[PDB]
Amino acid sequence: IVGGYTCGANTVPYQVSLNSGYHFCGGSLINSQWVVSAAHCYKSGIQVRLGEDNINVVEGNEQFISASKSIVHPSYNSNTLNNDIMLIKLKSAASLNSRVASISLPTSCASAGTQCLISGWGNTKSSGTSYPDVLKCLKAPILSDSSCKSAYPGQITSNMFCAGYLEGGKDSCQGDSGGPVVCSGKLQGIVSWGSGCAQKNKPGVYTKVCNYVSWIKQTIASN
Numbered sequence: 001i002v003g004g005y006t007c008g009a010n011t012v013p014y015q016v017s018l019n020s021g022y023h024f025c026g027g028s029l030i031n032s033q034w035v036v037s038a039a040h041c042y043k044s045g046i047q048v049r050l051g052e053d054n055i056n057v058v059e060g061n062e063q064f065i066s067a068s069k070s071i072v073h074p075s076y077n078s079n080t081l082n083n084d085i086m087l088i089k090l091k092s093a094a095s096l097n098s099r100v101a102s103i104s105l106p107t108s109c110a111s112a113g114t115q116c117l118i119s120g121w122g123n124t125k126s127s128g129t130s131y132p133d134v135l136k137c138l139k140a141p142i143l144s145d146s147s148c149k150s151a152y153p154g155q156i157t158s159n160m161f162c163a164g165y166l167e168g169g170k171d172s173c174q175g176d177s178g179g180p181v182v183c184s185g186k187l188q189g190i191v192s193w194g195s196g197c198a199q200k201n202k203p204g205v206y207t208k209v210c211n212y213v214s215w216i217k218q219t220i221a222s223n
């Protein structure tokens with residue numbers, strides 16, 4: 001997250017870190033046994049880390065649980081990035097409490113101008129790299145479909161939206177992929193892609209979770 005702020009420990013209790021000997025992506029806890037992340041985050045050897053603030057120090061409140069299933073959307077396209085969503089089933093259920101809690105799925109899509117909270121342990125620099133110890137947060141609005149398509153012509157599908165700031169300085173970044181975009185208590189987005197980070201006229205692009213609620217429910221019910 002570039003241009004954000006330190007969330008505060010456990011203030012985003014649905015935020016998870018996906019770890020393979022290092023933090024590589026975020027995710028969102030949607031019930032005690034399932035996490036939503038990005039398809040492009042798929043790999044073998046995923047350990048889900050819940051309850052984290054400083055990802056480099058054991059502080060208390062962490063739960064480390066291996067992924068038992070990692071289900072990339074069958075129609076994920078690694079060139080267009082359409083359908084950039086994955087479900088992870090935990091080997092055991094997480095213990096839910098104030099510091100580890102699920103986030104609700106949307107019942108409807110969010111409108112342009114809706115304010116959201118985006119979070120992660122990704123890069124905090126627009127040029128160069130700096131990775132934080134603690135979780136970072138950014139408040140950001142959803143942009144209009146016309147502004148999003150103007151920024152990224154030919155590249156925005158119905159399963160994507162833009163959020164952030166066209167003036168530069170405030171965005172998600174590498175290391176944030178798979179993490180949450182929460183608006184009015186609902187998980188509306190997944191950190192997906194963008195051109196650079198926090199660059200003028202190049203907002204973040206996010207998977208439009210409201211299009212996948214039925215797919216998520218059906219996939220969880222059958223697994």
Ligand SMILES: [Ca+2]
Pocket residue numbers: 052053054055056057058059060062
């Ligand atoms: Ca920790």
